[PDB]
């Protein structure tokens, strides 16, 4: 699917996925390309957090959607 994932530096990376994919799968796809471990990944859509055992279709996440990636920053 043609969808967008927006990062905190204002960068968006695009992935091709299927709705039957798990939240676990998205995190794995993002990891391969940016190197962040899934246990470090937090995914947000329509102000809701996506849960690991769910599929994209469960949240009705469709083509041309924009996703948010949250980072947990130290200080």
């Amino acid at each position: 699917m043609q969808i967008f994932v927006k990062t905190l530096t204002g960068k968006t990376i695009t992935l091709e996925v299927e709705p039957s994919d798990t939240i676990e799968n998205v995190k794995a796809k993002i990891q391969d390309k940016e190197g962040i471990p899934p246990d470090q990944q937090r995914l947000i859509f329509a102000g809701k957090q996506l849960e690991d055992g769910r599929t994209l279709s469960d949240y009705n996440i469709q083509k041309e959607s924009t996703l948010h990636l949250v980072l947990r920053l130290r200080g």
């Binding site: 905190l8 530096t9 470090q40 947000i44 102000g47 948010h68």
Partner: protein, 250 residues
Amino acid sequence: DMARRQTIEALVPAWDSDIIFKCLCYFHTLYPGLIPLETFPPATIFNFKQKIISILEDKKAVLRGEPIKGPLPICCSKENYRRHLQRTTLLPVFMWYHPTPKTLSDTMQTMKQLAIKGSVGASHWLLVIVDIQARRLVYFDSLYNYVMPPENMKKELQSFAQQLDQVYPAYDSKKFSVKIAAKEVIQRGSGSSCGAWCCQFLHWYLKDPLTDALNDLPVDSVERHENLASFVQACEAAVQDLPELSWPEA
């Protein structure tokens, strides 16, 4: 002393953007005038001013019944965000700082890497409270002058206050005032406790916007962090069962 730092570090470990955020969400349920601004990403020294102006312009738009123009938060619905903008009297603007990067873009990059790496480094949490109701900008640096001399920050904030008077004029002629909170190093003996200190100071400020709590701190550096440890423990117990990455209802 090695003992002293080792224990001060053990007492109050670094706080990350999530515990700070959960803390802000919780503080909003206590003090509904506080809007729990997201810390992911936080503001920086390079853009905290435009971020504040943007938030206040959206507040004016909401008060007029108009669309907002500024960015939506990630973990909040559009409608709940308008209700928070309507309600809010206090902006807790957390700022993430590091001496290395000298621009916004560089700061965000430095920020990103240290997150994936997972390190504190020489990064620092600052807090600017925008008290809309009292028209007061409070600048809290637990390291006192980690960014710049406080007298310098005061001057910079005074000119910013002057444009907040134009952006967000009061009913009357009341001008935004500024307060440099810390007049000594607060975080004595720690290189880690800034995030917690910011939230403790914010809470003291929510309880009393004229709080002299910093001036009444014990002199001892370990005693400060014992007390701060107790606060931290209270916060973690209070947010334990609160929702992850989800704004409370305005």
